[PDB]
Amino acid sequence: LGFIAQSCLAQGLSTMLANLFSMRSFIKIEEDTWQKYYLEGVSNEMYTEYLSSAFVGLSFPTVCELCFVKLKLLMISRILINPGNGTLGFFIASDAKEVKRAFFYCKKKYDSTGMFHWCAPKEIEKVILTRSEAAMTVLSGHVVVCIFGDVSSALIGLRNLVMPLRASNFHYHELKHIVFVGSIEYLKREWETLHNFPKVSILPGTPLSRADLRAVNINLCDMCVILSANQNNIDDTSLQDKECILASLNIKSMQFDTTGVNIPIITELVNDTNVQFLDQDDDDDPDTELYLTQPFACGTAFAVSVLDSLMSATYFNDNILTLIRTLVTGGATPELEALIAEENALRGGYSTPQTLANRDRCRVAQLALLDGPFADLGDGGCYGDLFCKALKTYNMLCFGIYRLRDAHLSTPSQCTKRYVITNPPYEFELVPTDLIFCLMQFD
Amino acid sequence: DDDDDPDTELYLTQPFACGTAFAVSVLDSLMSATYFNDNILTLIRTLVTGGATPELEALIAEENALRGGYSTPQTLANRDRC
Amino acid sequence: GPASFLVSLASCLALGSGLTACRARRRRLRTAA
Amino acid sequence: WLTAAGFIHLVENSGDPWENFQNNQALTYWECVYLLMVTMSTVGYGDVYAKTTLGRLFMVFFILGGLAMFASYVPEIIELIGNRKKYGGSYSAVSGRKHIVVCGHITLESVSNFLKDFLHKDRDDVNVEIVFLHNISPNLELEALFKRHFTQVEFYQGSVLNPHDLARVKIESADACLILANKYCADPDAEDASNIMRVISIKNYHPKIRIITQMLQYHNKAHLLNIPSWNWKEGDDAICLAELK
Amino acid sequence: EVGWMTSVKDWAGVMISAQTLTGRVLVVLVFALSIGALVIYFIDSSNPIESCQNFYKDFTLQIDMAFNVFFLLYFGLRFIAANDKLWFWLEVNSVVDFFTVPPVFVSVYLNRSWLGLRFLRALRLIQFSEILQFLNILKTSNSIKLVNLLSIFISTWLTAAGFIHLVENSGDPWENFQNNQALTYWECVYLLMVTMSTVGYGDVYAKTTLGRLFMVFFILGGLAMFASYVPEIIELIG
Ligand SMILES: [Ca+2]
Ligand SMILES: [Ca+2]
Ligand SMILES: [Mg+2]
């Protein structure tokens, strides 16, 4: 759910986050396709390494930026992400052989803590909506969650989905509205924990209904999430996510006053085989792995099977798991774990100067390229200059490139799906139509 | 008041021949007729269930609930069906 | 062996082609009748 | 087998020591192999047998451990060798003759009814070849029915969900795809679900193909309209049996 | 047009099946002449391994020539209608045709008859369930399975007995054919029945090196066949 929410904040983040943990060796293909560039980003894994004595001098932060040219590697006492303003460097090196180059080379508004947002409890009747008011209410760039459930269905737990979207550096004006569509009985069952959350709406019905989706302004939503809970009841392989897929398709097949095929929608699949049904303009082979599938590479698909590699990475150095918990789901401060353990219900209080000071966290964001002062680097032909300028001007580091699938071909196309690139090489050509992953700071 | 033999087919049975019996098994032959020229299925849909106009299919798809409005001269003109 | 097998195969193919040709013109040339 | 045969050869050629090696039967190694094969197979011709005291003792102590071994290994070895896919391979696309693919609920009665209605002499002289695609291998009755339609139908065992099996039946040149439905089911929703899956799976491989299918409910038929490539204009069909009934 | 090769392939496929009167006649003729060839091999078994017989002064050789000519024509018809040529070449009926017809042709040419692989004609007995299913006589699953089991069992039994007869009558070549046991075909049938039934009286048995080798390699594949077919055949009959 944290990866899903991260993808909602910035599309394609879940795919690269999952790929950063799986150990993949470098592979090359002769043909020039979209997979050729994608496979150059999956080769980068998440590592932990100590710093050198050359970087322990006047200041830890100022040396971190712009030093990646010499080291040819990326950097990301305590948990440190984009350190601005003995330390374990969270690297994105492609292998453990060349990661030994840092130390070796020497030339009531908030919650009880302020990590999230809190508001007065709400009653289920004060948030239940209807097609009349849902269409009347205006929603743009919001979050829509399609929930499948029944009377005897299992419990997913939506508290971990709205939590990542309500971080400290997310202002109330910038907070993304979340609306849940599905059976009201399931939401009533989950309402015991889903009541201290602000800016939430629930529309009864089913996600398979076009009118209910039309009411909640699906066309202009920032991200559509398809989730299911009944898959633990049926044991038939063919029938499993036989659901979810139909809805993803109805979403794609809708027609507005344009077609909804380009609507950003992410689907959770329990069976990895069903992913071939997500897209029709792609090669479907059961032999290929999930990470090679186009819908997964584009950030529109996610499965729990890619998280099984987390155990091996966690074992070798445990610092990664807490880094994951502070990179997704907002932040898992030691105190918050105890508070959740003892009350099992998030509560807040009056803010303090130190409470507001707990806001220096930098969170992910998606940046365009068509407009901005950095337009000179839109087609500069060198990716390294782009992130060097980002670091040396506005203090922002980019994970990589969110690139169009058909941008590699000279002829134009109407394709909209974009796949993820993690840490492109220094001599990497750029395209004017592109999206940039970044860790924006607070203000 | 009829001869009951398990060997005989449903279409030969007196209650079915008199229109007092119906089963979904007689509709399995619809696929073969539909394949050879598809115009029959829409002819079936316009001969039974009143009429399946292209617009009505979309309206049922999007709201899943039949609704009406004020009539128009062209709306009343859509009545020449026999 | 092989020569007799080839002769039998050629005879079968010729008989089939001749029968097909005879039936074809018997059927088409008399479609109206 | 070889170790027992070698031990018998050594014992029979080299007589028992307490008899001053005076029981040399002069048995070749191949003869001992044959004797071991006969003895552990329970047949026991008796033309070749052990005569020395040690040979008879080893035969007695080897019968118990070898008869069971033979009876438990030979049929099982045959069973593992016989594991094969009878209805494999792909379909060859013949030029000038269109073919259709039929999948879904395939059964002796349904297939027979479809064949007798599709291939009736009442229709015009049209030569369309039917290719079946089912996961479960046909039984003797269904194979016998297919034999009576030797030049008109073919069967290929496989799953419609697998894109490889769809390429095996060559849907690229197929005229139409036909999906039968299990009307007499205990869960119409589940049957419509599986069928909507094939609908999709077929669409994912080749959107351009036309589909004639049976739906037991009207809401599932409405859900079929949500499929992106539900091109009913050029050709597509969805017979709702409940609606038509 | 529509393909001349496809037209003749479809014509042969219709002819092989019993879909037309000519097809049914050909199928019945194949059945009858397979039975007749088996009977002819049974009669000719009493003759020595090698002999000289005049084609135009003998009554059996002419009938055998007609039978194998018809079998050659049927093989050609099957080959025209065959889907895959390589896998049709490896079928059991094709192999027995290849090892049965050319030797009789050579025997007619050379005026000298050798009882070699003529026992393979019993393998033609296998293709009987397909013959009955083409004629629509055999429909129900139980009877189809019973006919399949009976045909396979009898064909394998007769083929093994014929191979034993050939091997025992014609001694191993490396011993200058000095191991002629002089076993009648009925005696070989009895020996095969006894051996695959596990009983093993031992009064009749193979003494040649090739005969013992075939017995060893046939016990494994025949004891299981007998034990799995005879009780099951009895069950379907009952
Ligand atoms: Ca790597
Ligand atoms: Ca696909
Ligand atoms: Mg065919």
If you had to describe this structure to a student in words, what would you say it looks like?
By secondary structure, chain A is α/β, with parallel strands linked by helices. Chain A contains 16 helices and 12 strands. Chain A has helices at residues 2-9, 13-19, 34-38, 60-64, 68-71, 131-136, 159-162, 184-189, 210-215, 242-253, 294-297, 310-316, 319-327, 334-343, 353-357, 383-394, and strands spanning 47-50, 88-91, 143-148, 178-182, 200-203, 223-228, 265-268, 301-302, 363-367, 400-404, 418-422, 435-440. Chain A has a 6-stranded parallel beta sheet with strand order 5-4-3-6-7-8, with helices on both faces. Chain A has a 4-stranded antiparallel beta sheet with strand order 9-12-10-11. In chain A, strands 1-2 form a two-stranded antiparallel sheet. In chain A, strand 3, helix 7 (159-162) and strand 4 (178-182) form a beta-alpha-beta unit. In chain A, helix 1 (2-9) packs across helix 2. In chain C, 82% of the residues lie in helices and 0% in strands. By secondary structure, chain C is mainly alpha-helical. Classes of the chains: A alpha/beta (443), C mainly alpha (33). Chains in contact: A-B, A-D, B-D, C-E, D-E. Chain D binds chain E through residues 30, 33-34, 37-38, 41-47, 74-75, 78, 89, 92, 94-97, 127, 139-141, 143-144, 147-148, 150-151, and chain E through 1-3, 6, 10, 13-14, 16-17, 19, 81, 83-84, 130, 133-134, 136, 138-141, 144-145, 195, 198-202, 205, 209, 212, 215-216, 219-221, 223-224, 227-228.
